[PDB]
From a paper:
The operon spr0693-spr0694-spr0695 of S. pneumoniae R6 encodes a putative ABC transporter that contributes to the resistance of antibiotics and antimicrobial peptides. Sequence analyses suggest that the Spr0693–0694–0695 assembly is similar to Escherichia coli MacAB, with Spr0693 and Spr0694–0695 corresponding to MacA and MacB, respectively. Here we present the crystal structures of S. pneumoniae Spr0694–0695 and Spr0693, representing the structure of a MacAB-like efflux pump in Gram-positive bacteria. In summary, the structure of Spr0694-Spr0695 reveals some features for this family of ABC transporters, which are characterized by a unique 8-TM fold and an ECD/PLD insertion between TM1 and TM2.
Author numbering:
A (entry chain B): 2 to 227
B (entry chain M): 2 to 65, 91 to 416
C (entry chain S): 1 to 61, 91 to 263, 273 to 416
D (entry chain A): 2 to 14, 20 to 227
């Protein structure tokens, strides 16, 4: 059950003379099927924490044990394998490649996984079904709505059956009505047992998650574990 | 895989890619067209190079200038393996007839064996005869296209007086050969032939200059050559000089790599276009990095490695410049073939510019161009930080 | 002229892209202006030598003429000096070595200081060469070296000018000889015209030249000399603008091959301007919402491609002047005594072209930019 | 006084978007337009902004008839009279705050020196201090929309057309930007805005609802 396990994590962003500290003694653990929501002001480095967990950033000092094995320090070539298999990234603006249709935009992570073309289209189809996409999969993101683009983006986040879904303000480019539709989807997905860790500046949205975390000045400053 | 992502991107911006290719088409086809002609010109000399290996030129070296008797050369030519021999004069001539003129023709001085030995085919009138030598006759043969230039027709040319160098000559025949047809490239207005004894008597020059032996089995030349030279000195009497074999290649290669030089200078000027084309493909590749900075970042979040991106953007520029230098290589090969089916009013000689060495060199260059001008961008893209890009 | 400020803001937006786009046009205009300028120097040089061919009035009318009359007529007020010459283009051998179709002048006594042949080895024609009927010869510097390696080496040795033995008594040079290379003259040997008439059975005197060194006098004087030299026995420059034509042709053919690189450079900008338009469709809509017309956007995106090529042309021109000066120094071996450089017509021909390159290629994207719908853009 | 007066405005494409639109709007008003998707929500707005010309009917802007004017004419009218505000801000990336604000004044014929004065006055009106020369690269979202709102005000338009102004902004910073608009409405600038959120429409005086090309509700009756 135990997935994320940060420990004594620091991240200092050097910049000429400025050894500017952001994360400091981040201690944190996250178990499978959890729905954590991370909140806090600007400069707290929810960003820096999130990338640290998503393996897009390596911490200055400390440890990060993904499924028990330490992963801060792996070579880029090997680390990029771990990322492909374990992290499903969901972004605020949806980051759909505009020359690919929804289907093949969702297939993209399967290529880097090294999946056969037979399977890739059917894995994609099944997961576009899971997120409930009505407008046809053979359309560019040009001809898709907001909630439909974020659905595709979440399908793409799911295709390689990852351990963690990192979401960064998913409702942020969406209206209350269709945002609440996407937030139920995330609830339904986490109900099926898929772990989620979401950043938001919105109390209304953090409310949907099983566990609240707050950061002040790069220090985890209140959990719901105790 | 990395090849498919390459092709997808090119297809994504078709008219951008197309336009980029056109810069490489233009440049490759310019260089290949110029390189074709300069090669075809070169290869049509290298035909004559190997016809000349049947000949064995002997000359008077002063160190290991006495009058050379012709019957020495006939006696030397007895030597087994020697099929024929001949001796010649040469000179320049300005060749006026009526109101016409060809002011740089190379007037040759035969010796009764010459015409037969070199196998010149008489098309109008007669070849040199025995009478013409014993009468010291100022008689002249003209090559096919000298007769056409000077008298409208080989037939019409017969029994006309043509002033040679202010010296009246009577036209006895018109000849043609392979060599005469194609000898405009060596920079000659004509190849008229007369008796060596006429050249030697009209103009001051003495009557033998080049001494030649034809040896149709060419494998004998390394041995028969110096033997014919030795035999010449045994007959000439030891006049303290010694006859030696003239090297044929040191005067052919002297004009072979003068054509080569001047091909390179014009081929380079055309190459400037391919070089500009190259900077063009680099530049558009760089816009496709900044165009796709977020895309690369997303790709790396999904599991693209630096290495993947690096070879993807390489492959993408290579697909442009190869497909370019192939469309280009073809359109060159075309124009070259129709430039040849056109040069027929000047040359009777194979000029298609197919030359496998230049074809393969075009592709070899076309590859290098994409590889060279495509790495800085492909590098840039491979190094992009996912966090800064997202 | 906000379109010019808009153009420069855009150019400066992507500096290293606008730079790489300009480099196509620099590389293009440089190489075109270099070929055009050498070919122009070769033509302008030939054109200077025609204004020497007007200080030499030549009278022609055969009957056998006589130097006594030319000497007489040369007292006339404008006439600076005279000379009379003898011609053949015969071949100079020297023991296996062989120069082809050298222009063998046969001068009279006055010929040496009237034309001014500066001798660099030995001696010029003395009178005891005329009087004693000697077969002696002067060689030109480049004919001297080609036939005998050095200048001093050639001296006091035997040449075979068309067969006849001539003793090399000296070797000379001038500017007019050093450029005889370009008129296809194999060499310019001078000799005694007495010994050209003896050794070749040509007339002693065949050209009659009246040196007049007042340019604004050859009309009226020159026709008088022709009708004085006709009282005894009862015209204009030759094919000088023929080499002028032939060079200009070879300049074109080569300069056009260089010009392809400017055509690719031109498709260069068109490709970069086309991405410019797509990649700021949103700007174009924004601008039109702020009150930009169809026509405004049109002549903005056009001025930008014109400035971009025009700059490249203007830079390329400059870099093709440094290049077309050390080209001058390179051609102090081959041709030499030449003023090589980029004339004012050639210079602004390139500006007109580079401006025009920017326009031709740049109207197509500037149009696409102009017809963009603001609604779909935003 | 009266500024907007749409009467019998049809827009069709074969799809029909607007259908007998009849709306009047007076100076100083603050109208919030809401409606379901594809009601002609945006086609109305782009009609009022003169980016779309109706298939029939009439539109009087400050009393001037503008429907079916020429492209050159309708750009000047747009320039003098309309101040577009956008959800996504639409600032040019290579121009700093001051220059971005100066741009509509370039398309009017105003002195290069005077532009600088007017731009700084309107960066002041929107409480943006010491970021005169910042690029959008260097500004927050609130700061960006503040710059974009200054650009809408600089030409003293009759109308501020606003399309979900706080959509890219968080709820805190939206409320700040929404207050900014209210204050500008209090000083007397007319705002026709469009929004999907009732929390945002709340701020306006009047409340229009369009359903299928025709106005259905109107809190002014
Ligand atoms: Mg943060
Ligand atoms: Mg709508």
């Amino acid at each position: 059950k135990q997935l994320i396990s940060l420990k004594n994590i620091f991240r200092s962003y050097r910049n000429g003379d400025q050894e500017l500290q952001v994360l400091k003694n981040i201690n944190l653990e996250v178990n499978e099927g959890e729905f954590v929501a991370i909140m806090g002001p600007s400069g707290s480095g929810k960003s820096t924490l999130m990338n640290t967990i998503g393996m897009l950033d390596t911490p200055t000092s400390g440890e990060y044990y993904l499924e028990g094995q330490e992963v801060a320090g792996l070579g880029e070539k090997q680390l990029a394998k771990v990322r492909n298999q374990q992290i499903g990234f969901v972004f605020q603006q949806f980051f759909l490649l505009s020359k690919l249709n929804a289907l093949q935009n969702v297939e993209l992570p399967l290529i880097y996984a090294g999946v056969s073309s037979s399977k890739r289209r059917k894995l994609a189809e099944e997961y576009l079904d899971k997120v409930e996409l009505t407008e046809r999969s053979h359309h560019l993101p040009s001809e898709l709505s907001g909630g439909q683009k974020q659905r595709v983006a979440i399908a793409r986040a799911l295709v390689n059956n990852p351990s963690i879904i990192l979401a960064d303000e998913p409702t942020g480019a969406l209206d209350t009505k269709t945002g609440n539709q996407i937030m139920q989807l995330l609830v339904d997905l986490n109900k099926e047992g898929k772990t989620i860790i979401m950043v938001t500046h919105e109390p209304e949205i953090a409310a949907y998650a099983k566990r609240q975390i707050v950061i002040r000045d790069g220090v985890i400053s209140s959990d719901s574990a105790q | 895989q990395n090849l498919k992502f390459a092709f997808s991107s090119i297809m994504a911006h078709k008219m951008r890619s197309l336009l980029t290719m056109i810069g490489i088409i233009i440049g490759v086809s310019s260089v290949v067209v110029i390189m074709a002609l300069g090669d075809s010109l070169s290869r049509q000399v290298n035909k004559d190079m190997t016809k000349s290996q049947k000949n064995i030129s002997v000359f008077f070296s002063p160190k290991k200038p006495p009058k050379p008797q012709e019957s020495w050369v006939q006696e030397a030519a007895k030597l087994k393996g020697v099929d024929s021999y001949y001796v010649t004069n040469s000179t320049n001539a300005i060749l006026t007839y009526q109101d016409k003129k060809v002011e740089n023709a190379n007037l040759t001085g035969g010796n009764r064996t010459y015409m037969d030995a070199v196998k010149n085919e008489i098309i109008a009138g007669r070849s040199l005869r025995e009478q013409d030598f014993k009468e010291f006759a100022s008689v002249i043969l003209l090559d096919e296209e000298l007769s056409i230039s000077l008298f409208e027709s080989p037939q019409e040319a017969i029994n006309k007086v043509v002033e040679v160098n202010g010296f009246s000559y009577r036209v006895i025949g018109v000849y043609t050969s392979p060599e005469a047809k194609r000898s405009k490239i060596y920079g000659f207005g004509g190849l008229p032939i007369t008796t060596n004894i006429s050249l030697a008597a009209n103009f001051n020059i003495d009557e033998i200059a080049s001494i030649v032996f034809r040896v149709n089995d060419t494998s004998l030349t390394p041995t028969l050559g110096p033997e014919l030279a030795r035999k010449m000195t045994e007959l000439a009497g030891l006049q303290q000089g010694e006859y030696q074999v003239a090297d044929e290649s040191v005067v052919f290669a002297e004009i072979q790599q003068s054509f080569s030089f001047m091909t390179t200078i014009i081929s380079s000027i055309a190459g400037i276009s391919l070089f500009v084309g190259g900077t063009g493909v680099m530049n558009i590749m760089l816009v496709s990095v900044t165009e796709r900075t977020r895309e690369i970042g997303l790709r790396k979040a999904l599991g693209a490695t630096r290495a993947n991106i690096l070879i993807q953007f390489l492959i993408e520029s290579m697909i442009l410049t190869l497909l370019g230098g192939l469309i280009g290589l073809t359109i060159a090969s075309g124009l070259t073939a129709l430039a040849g089916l056109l040069l027929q009013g000047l040359i009777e000689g194979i000029e298609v510019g197919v030359s496998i060495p230049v074809a393969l060199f075009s592709l070899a260059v076309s590859a290098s161009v994409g590889m060279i001008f495509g790495v800085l961008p492909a590098n840039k893209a491979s190094k992009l930080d996912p966090i800064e890009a997202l």
